[PDB]
Design a protein around this ligand. Structure first.
Ligand code: NA
Lengths: 7, 424
């Protein structure tokens, strides 16, 4: 799992 | 002003000898890579920006360019293994480990997130993060009397990043790194926040998926009771990982399985085997199949918690996958049980739903169900009641099913006629 920081 | 920039414009600004111009282009790059749809990760990589972003991680006097560079590099590493590799190949890992000691918490948190994406790619980049020394400064951020004094998101990111350093096999995480993290992971398993609790249960799930010595490290830290309490949480996000870890601890020794039964886990299975989520039911029925494979005293503890009627019901109605895990739990139970226990299974109503599954296609379940029918017929021979069992099977429509078991598989029609001839 990877997580993109959005906004 | 840094909104909807072109990549050529971001490149012109980063190629300038003005750190303020480089900061506004690095912020325009983050804003493009933080957009909800189609982040241009490949266009930013083709532009040759990763090297300049990794040097900006070292700019102590421009904390803003360090945060913008960490966010941009975190989002490139959020993508494909190829995109995560371009970040690791730019020298990012040592630079993100220095940023863990940043006085700014927002920059330190982005370095944590980045490291989490790098380690989440696989065991090789997980093990390279651990070799560059990430653990000591990660665990130093949590070195506080009360974890409740830290920000919710900061602890949630640090707990997800530690989870990724405990994840993946072939190879599995380094034993020295697993024993250096476990003490802090146990503190987070006792935390009030549900996302921290869920990511802490997933980390124990990853550390329990392995050889019995890995299970022992975790069970020696005294986590099984807290995992059994989190198995009763109302939040599926916490129950799904808590069950996997309890299930992975019952793959080990009968002494490790006995710590779960001693922590009181068999009292939660009545609800886990009736759970509306098919994954929780199937995973819980699989955990019950490894508990029915243990000692007769452990099988007696399943009987005492009233779980046999619940396994007769998963066999009666559930996703075929759960019903196949239930056939396996009934065959393990009928293999290692006493005759008193095997006759209790027939009194609870195992005959009809077991036989109704012999009309299925899978040869595996048919071989498992016919292996449990023989074990029950062998216990009936020791009591002189095989005829009654035969009549009971005949009335449920079972002799008819086994008669048809004309099958491609040899062992199937072989055992079928070994039972048709010996008992019917
Ligand atoms: Na009987």
């Amino acid at each position: 799992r990877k997580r993109r920081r959005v906004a | 002003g840094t909104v909807n920039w072109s990549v050529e414009d971001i490149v012109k600004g980063i190629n300038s000898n003005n750190l303020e111009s480089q900061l506004q282009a690095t912020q325009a790059a983050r804003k493009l890579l933080s957009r909800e749809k189609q982040p241009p990760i490949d266009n930013i990589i083709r532009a040759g920006l990763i090297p300049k972003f990794v040097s900006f991680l070292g700019k102590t006097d421009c904390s803003p360019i360090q945060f913008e560079s960490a966010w941009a590099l975190t989002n490139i590493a959020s993508g494909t293994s190829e995109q995560t590799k371009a970040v690791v190949d730019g020298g990012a890992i040592p630079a993100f480990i220095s940023l863990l000691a940043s006085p700014h918490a927002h920059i330190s948190e982005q370095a944590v997130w980045a490291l989490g994406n790098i380690a989440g790619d696989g065991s090789a980049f997980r093990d390279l993060v651990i070799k560059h020394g990430a653990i000591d400064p990660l665990l130093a951020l949590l070195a506080v009397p009360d974890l409740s004094t830290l920000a919710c998101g900061y602890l949630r990111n640090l707990t997800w990043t530690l989870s990724n350093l405990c994840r993946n096999k072939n190879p599995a995480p380094p034993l020295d790194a697993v024993e250096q993290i476990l003490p802090t992971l146990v503190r987070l398993l006792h935390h009030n926040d549900p996302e921290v609790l869920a990511d802490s249960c997933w980390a124990i799930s990853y550390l329990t998926d392995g050889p019995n010595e890995r299970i022992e490290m975790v069970v020696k830290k005294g986590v099984v009771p807290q995992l059994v309490k989190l198995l009763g949480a109302t939040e599926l996000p916490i129950v799904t990982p808590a069950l996997r870890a309890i299930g992975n601890i019952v793959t080990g020794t009968d002494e490790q399985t006995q710590k779960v039964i001693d922590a009181g886990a068999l009292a939660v299975f009545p609800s886990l085997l009736t759970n509306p989520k098919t994954n929780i039911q199937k995973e819980a029925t699989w955990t019950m199949s490894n508990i029915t494979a243990g000692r007769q005293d452990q099988i007696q503890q399943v009987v005492n918690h009233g779980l046999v009627p619940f396994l007769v019901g998963v066999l009666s109605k559930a996703d075929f996958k759960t019903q196949k895990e239930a056939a396996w739990a009934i065959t393990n139970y009928t293999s290692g049980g006493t005759v008193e226990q095997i006759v209790y299974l027939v009194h609870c109503g195992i005959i009809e739903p077991l036989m109704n599954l012999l009309s299925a296609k899978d040869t595996k379940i048919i071989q498992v169900i016919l292996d449990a029918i023989s074990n029950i017929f062998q216990a009936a021979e020791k009591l002189g009641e095989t005829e009654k069992l035969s009549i009971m099977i005949e009335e449920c429509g079972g002799l008819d099913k086994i008669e048809a078991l004309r099958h491609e598989n040899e062992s199937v029609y072989k055992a079928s006629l070994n039972l048709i001839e010996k008992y019917f």
